[PDB]
């Protein structure tokens, strides 16, 4: 895309060891599936296009970008070794939103609704088997 947006996060790397675990399967089949289809998912389904949104400071502030489209691809590509890596990606996505935006803001309200759902689902994450 625009040279003024950063390259998106890595979703493929043959040198990175990978595994499928039951926890990772749950994160794709239950957690991501639930959040992806939520009414408020759309701002989080792809990287922030700071040029199109006219937010030239976005990637000055947010140095650790993450989005659900990247997480979806990481899960589909079996990019992760364990569930914590994936959970950390979701946490980074929510924290980016809270850092950049204000407590009033529509996108924050949306992120908070998604994060509540995420927490509920992670509380039921199965033991690794
Ligand atoms: C309002 O700024 C934004 C912040 C994040 Br994080 C995602 C989308 C946005 O529009």
């Amino acid at each position: 895309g625009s040279h003024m947006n950063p390259p998106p996060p890595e979703t493929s790397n043959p040198n990175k060891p990978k595994r499928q675990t039951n926890q990772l399967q749950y994160l794709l089949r239950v957690v991501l599936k639930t959040l992806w289809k939520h009414q408020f998912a759309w701002p989080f389904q792809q990287p922030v296009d700071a040029v199109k949104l006219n937010l030239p400071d976005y990637y000055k502030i947010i140095k650790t970008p993450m989005d659900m489209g990247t997480i979806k691809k990481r899960l589909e590509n079996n990019y992760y070794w364990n569930a914590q890596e994936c959970i950390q990606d979701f946490n980074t996505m929510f924290t980016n939103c809270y850092i950049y935006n204000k407590p009033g803001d529509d996108i924050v309200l949306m992120a908070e609704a998604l994060e509540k759902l995420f927490l509920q689902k992670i509380n039921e994450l199965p033991t690794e088997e």
Side-chain angles (χ1 to χ4, degrees):
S2 70
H3 76 289
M4 300 194 188
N5 289 315
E10 188 176 75
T11 63
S12 171
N13 184 341
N15 293 319
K16 181 187 190 292
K18 312 300 202 306
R19 184 173 73 137
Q20 292 181 155
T21 73
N22 68 311
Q23 296 185 326
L24 281 163
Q25 287 177 358
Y26 173 92
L27 282 161
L28 174 56
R29 294 175 210 311
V30 177
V31 184
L32 178 67
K33 176 166 177 341
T34 296
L35 263 70
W36 187 265
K37 68 185 173 43
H38 194 280
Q39 186 175 236
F40 290 161
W42 60 269
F44 306 98
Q45 285 172 334
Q46 59 289 305
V48 173
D49 183 345
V51 175
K52 192 170 193 185
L53 292 170
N54 195 19
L55 297 178
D57 69 344
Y58 186 82
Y59 293 109
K60 181 66 174 153
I61 306 313
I62 299 306
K63 297 305 193 184
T64 68
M66 188 46 59
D67 67 278
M68 288 205 300
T70 297
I71 297 170
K72 180 171 181 289
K73 282 193 183 41
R74 284 179 172 194
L75 288 163
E76 291 173 338
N77 286 357
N78 305 298
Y79 178 78
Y80 297 115
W81 186 262
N82 65 37
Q84 188 57 207
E85 288 177 79
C86 177
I87 290 166
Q88 178 58 239
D89 287 343
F90 279 102
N91 289 338
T92 296
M93 182 185 75
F94 290 126
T95 60
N96 290 340
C97 185
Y98 303 147
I99 286 173
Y100 187 76
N101 298 285
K102 283 196 179 63
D105 285 351
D106 279 339
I107 193 169
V108 171
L109 297 175
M110 296 166 83
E112 286 176 316
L114 294 172
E115 185 181 28
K116 176 174 178 192
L117 233 200
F118 177 71
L119 172 56
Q120 292 178 302
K121 296 323 214 158
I122 234 60
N123 289 345
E124 303 162 34
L125 182 75
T127 300
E128 204 190 70
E129 80 195 349

